[PDB]
PDB file of C-alpha atoms and ligand atoms in Angstrom:
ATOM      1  CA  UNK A   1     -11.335  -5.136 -11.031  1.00 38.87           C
ATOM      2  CA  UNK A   2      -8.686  -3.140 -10.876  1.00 40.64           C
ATOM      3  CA  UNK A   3      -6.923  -2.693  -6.790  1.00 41.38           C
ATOM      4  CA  UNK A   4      -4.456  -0.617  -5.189  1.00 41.69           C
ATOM      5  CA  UNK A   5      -5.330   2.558  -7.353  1.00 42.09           C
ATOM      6  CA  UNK A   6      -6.473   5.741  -5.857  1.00 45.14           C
ATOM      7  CA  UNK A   7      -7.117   9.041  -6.265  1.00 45.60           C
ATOM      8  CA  UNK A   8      -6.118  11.166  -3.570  1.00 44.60           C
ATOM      9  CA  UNK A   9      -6.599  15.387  -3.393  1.00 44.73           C
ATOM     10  CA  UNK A  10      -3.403  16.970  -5.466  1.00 41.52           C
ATOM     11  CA  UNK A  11      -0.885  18.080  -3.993  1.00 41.85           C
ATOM     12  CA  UNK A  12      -1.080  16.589  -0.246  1.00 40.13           C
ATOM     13  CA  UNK A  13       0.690  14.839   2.096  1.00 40.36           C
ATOM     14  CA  UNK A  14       0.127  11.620   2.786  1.00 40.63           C
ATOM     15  CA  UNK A  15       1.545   8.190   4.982  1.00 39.96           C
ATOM     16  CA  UNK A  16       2.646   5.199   3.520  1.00 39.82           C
ATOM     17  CA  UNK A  17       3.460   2.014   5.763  1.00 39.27           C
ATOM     18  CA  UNK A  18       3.614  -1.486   4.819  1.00 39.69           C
ATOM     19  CA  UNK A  19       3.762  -4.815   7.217  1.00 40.63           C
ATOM     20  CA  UNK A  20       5.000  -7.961   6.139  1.00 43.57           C
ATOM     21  CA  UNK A  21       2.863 -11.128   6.890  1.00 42.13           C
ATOM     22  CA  UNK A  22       4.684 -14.273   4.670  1.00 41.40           C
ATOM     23  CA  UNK A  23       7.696 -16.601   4.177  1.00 42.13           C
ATOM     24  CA  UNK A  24       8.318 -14.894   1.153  1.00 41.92           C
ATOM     25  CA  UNK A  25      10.026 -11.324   0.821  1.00 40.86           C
ATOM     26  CA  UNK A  26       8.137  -8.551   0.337  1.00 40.97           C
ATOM     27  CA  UNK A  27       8.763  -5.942  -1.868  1.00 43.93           C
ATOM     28  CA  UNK A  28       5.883  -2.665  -1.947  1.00 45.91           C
ATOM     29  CA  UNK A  29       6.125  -0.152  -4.372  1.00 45.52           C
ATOM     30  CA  UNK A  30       4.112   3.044  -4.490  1.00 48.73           C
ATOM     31  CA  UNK A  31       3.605   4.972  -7.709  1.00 49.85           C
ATOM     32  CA  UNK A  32       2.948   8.965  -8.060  1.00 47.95           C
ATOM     33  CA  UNK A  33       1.489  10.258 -10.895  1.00 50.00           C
ATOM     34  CA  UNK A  34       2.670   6.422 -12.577  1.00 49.30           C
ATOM     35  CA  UNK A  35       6.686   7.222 -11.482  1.00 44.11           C
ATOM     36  CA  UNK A  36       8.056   5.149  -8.091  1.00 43.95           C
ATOM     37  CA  UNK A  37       7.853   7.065  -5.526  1.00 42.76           C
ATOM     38  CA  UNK A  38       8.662   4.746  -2.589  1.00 39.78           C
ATOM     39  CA  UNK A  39       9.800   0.972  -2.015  1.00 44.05           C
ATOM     40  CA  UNK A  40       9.774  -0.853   0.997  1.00 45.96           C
ATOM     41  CA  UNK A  41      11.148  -4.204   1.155  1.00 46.01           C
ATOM     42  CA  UNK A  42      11.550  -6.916   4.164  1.00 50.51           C
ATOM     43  CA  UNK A  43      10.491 -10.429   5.353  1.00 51.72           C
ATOM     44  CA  UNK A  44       8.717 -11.120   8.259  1.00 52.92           C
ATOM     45  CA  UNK A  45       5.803 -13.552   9.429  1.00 54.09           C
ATOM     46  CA  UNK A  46       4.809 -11.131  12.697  1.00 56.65           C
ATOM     47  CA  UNK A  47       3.645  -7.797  11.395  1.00 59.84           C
ATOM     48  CA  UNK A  48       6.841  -6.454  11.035  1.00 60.52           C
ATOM     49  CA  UNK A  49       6.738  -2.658   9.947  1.00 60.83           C
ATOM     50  CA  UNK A  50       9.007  -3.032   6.523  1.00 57.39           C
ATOM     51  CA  UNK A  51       8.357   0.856   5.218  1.00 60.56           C
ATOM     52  CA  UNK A  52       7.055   3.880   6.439  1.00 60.49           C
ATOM     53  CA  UNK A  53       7.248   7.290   4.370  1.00 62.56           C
ATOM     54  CA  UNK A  54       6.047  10.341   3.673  1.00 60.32           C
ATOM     55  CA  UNK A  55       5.136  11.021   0.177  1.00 61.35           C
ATOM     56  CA  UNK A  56       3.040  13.613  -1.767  1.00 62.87           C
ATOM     57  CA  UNK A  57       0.392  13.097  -4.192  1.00 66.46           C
ATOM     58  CA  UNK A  58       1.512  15.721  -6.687  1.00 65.43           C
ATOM     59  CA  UNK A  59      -0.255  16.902  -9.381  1.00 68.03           C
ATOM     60  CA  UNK A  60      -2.156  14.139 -10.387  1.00 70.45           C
ATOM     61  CA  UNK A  61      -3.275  12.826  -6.958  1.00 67.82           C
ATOM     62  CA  UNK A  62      -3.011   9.385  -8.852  1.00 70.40           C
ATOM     63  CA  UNK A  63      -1.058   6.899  -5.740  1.00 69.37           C
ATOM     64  CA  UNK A  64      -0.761   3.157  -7.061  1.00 71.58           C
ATOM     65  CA  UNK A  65       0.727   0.465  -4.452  1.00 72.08           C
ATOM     66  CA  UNK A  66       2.084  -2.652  -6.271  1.00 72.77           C
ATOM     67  CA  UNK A  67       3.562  -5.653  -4.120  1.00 70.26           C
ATOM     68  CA  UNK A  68       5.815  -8.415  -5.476  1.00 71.20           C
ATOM     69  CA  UNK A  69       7.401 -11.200  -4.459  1.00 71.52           C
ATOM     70  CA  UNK A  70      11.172 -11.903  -6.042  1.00 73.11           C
ATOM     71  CA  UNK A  71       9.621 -10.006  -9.268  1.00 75.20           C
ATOM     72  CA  UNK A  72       6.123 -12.205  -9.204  1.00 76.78           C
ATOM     73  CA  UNK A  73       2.986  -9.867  -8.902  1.00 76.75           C
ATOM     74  CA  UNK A  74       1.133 -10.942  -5.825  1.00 76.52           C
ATOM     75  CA  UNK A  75      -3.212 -10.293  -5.854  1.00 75.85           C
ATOM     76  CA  UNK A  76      -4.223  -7.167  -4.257  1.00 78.51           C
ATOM     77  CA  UNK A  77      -7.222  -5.813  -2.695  1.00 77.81           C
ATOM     78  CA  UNK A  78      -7.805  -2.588  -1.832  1.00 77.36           C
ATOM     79  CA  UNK A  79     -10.515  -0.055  -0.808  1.00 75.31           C
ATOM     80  CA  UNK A  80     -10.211   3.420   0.615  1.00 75.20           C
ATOM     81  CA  UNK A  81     -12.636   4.361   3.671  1.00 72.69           C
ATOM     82  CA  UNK A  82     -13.084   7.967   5.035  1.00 75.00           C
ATOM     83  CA  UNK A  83     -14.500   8.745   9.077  1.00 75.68           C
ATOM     84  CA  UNK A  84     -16.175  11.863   9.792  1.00 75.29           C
ATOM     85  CA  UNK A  85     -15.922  13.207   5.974  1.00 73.44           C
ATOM     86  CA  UNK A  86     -11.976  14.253   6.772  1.00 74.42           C
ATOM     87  CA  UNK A  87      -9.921  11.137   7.695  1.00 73.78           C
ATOM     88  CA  UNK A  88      -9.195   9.298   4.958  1.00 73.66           C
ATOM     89  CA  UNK A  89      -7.719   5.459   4.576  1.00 72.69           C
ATOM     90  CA  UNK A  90      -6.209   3.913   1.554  1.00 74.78           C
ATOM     91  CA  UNK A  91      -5.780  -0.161   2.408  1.00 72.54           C
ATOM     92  CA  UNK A  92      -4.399  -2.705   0.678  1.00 71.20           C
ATOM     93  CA  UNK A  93      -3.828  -6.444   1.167  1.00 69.51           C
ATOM     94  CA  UNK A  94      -1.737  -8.700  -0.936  1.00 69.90           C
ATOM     95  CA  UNK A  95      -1.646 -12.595  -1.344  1.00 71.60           C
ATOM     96  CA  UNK A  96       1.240 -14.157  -3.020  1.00 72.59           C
ATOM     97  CA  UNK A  97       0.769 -18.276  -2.396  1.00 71.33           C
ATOM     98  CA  UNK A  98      -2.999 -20.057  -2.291  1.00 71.54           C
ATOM     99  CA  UNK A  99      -3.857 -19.709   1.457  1.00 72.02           C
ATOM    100  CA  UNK A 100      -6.093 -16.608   0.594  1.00 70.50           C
ATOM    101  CA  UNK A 101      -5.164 -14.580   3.763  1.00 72.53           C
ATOM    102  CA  UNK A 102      -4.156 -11.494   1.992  1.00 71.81           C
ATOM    103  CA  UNK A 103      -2.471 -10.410   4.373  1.00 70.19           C
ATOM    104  CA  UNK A 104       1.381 -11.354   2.964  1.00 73.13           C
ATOM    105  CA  UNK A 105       1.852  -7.278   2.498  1.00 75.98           C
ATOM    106  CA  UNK A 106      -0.464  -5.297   4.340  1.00 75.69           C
ATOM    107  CA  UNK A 107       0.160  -1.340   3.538  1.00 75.80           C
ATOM    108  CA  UNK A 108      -1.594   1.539   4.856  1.00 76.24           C
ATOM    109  CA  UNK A 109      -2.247   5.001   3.298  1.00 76.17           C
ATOM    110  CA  UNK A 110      -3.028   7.664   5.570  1.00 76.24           C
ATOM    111  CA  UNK A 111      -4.331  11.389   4.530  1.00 75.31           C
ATOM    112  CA  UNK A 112      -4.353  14.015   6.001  1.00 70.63           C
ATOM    113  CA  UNK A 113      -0.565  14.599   8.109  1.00 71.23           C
ATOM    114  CA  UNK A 114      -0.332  17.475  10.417  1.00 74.65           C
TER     115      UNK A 114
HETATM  116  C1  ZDC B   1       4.081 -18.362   6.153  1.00 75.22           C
HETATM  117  C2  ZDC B   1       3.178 -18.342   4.908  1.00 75.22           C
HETATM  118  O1  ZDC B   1       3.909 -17.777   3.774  1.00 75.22           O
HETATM  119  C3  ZDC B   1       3.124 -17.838   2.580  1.00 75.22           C
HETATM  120  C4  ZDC B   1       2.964 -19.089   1.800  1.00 75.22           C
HETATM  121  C5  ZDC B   1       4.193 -19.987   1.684  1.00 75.22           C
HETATM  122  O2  ZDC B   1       4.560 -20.446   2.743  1.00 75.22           O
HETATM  123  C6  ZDC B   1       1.991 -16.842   2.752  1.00 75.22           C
HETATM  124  O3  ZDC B   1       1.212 -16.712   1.534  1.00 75.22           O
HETATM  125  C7  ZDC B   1       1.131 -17.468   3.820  1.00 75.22           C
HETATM  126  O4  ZDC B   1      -0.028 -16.616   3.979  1.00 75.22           O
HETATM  127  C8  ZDC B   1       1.845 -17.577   5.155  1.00 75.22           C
HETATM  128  O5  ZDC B   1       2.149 -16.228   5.565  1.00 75.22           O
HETATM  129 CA1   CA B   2      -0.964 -15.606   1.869  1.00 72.78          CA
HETATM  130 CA1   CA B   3       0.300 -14.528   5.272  1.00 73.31          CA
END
């Protein structure tokens, strides 16, 4: 199935905030309405914050994360979970080798700011 797709409310505010978890350089891009929006890139094997922005949703309210490594798509999986009916998380993990951690770029989407 398709991952790292989702529909947020038009025209918001939201967080975007990737970690890095490999050997291999990261690179996180985050689509608006199907146009980059934001790209984070970094290496680290401790969790290191490589991005954090502030983006909007637009008219479309369609956000897409994509995570690569040197130009290679990595795996992603995704799912979005909201707490008490107004916080909402978008989550995605990424695995770009065979140990199946997922957790090579980790990126968080947070809605709403304020
Ligand atoms: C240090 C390792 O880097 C990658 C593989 C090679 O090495 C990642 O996929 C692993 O999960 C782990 O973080
Ligand atoms: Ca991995
Ligand atoms: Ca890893």
């Amino acid at each position: 199935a398709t991952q790292g797709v989702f529909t947020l409310p038009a025209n918001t505010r939201f967080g975007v905030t990737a970690f890095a978890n490999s050997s291999g350089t990261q690179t996180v891009n985050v689509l608006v309405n199907n146009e980059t929006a934001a790209t984070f890139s970094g290496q680290s094997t401790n969790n290191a914050v490589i991005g954090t922005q502030v983006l909007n949703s637009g008219s479309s309210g369609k956000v897409q994360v994509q995570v690569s490594v040197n130009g290679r798509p990595s795996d992603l999986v995704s799912a979005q979970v909201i707490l008490t009916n107004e916080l909402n998380f978008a989550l995605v993990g990424s695995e770009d080798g065979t140990d199946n951690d997922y957790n090579d770029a980790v990126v968080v989407i947070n809605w709403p700011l304020g």
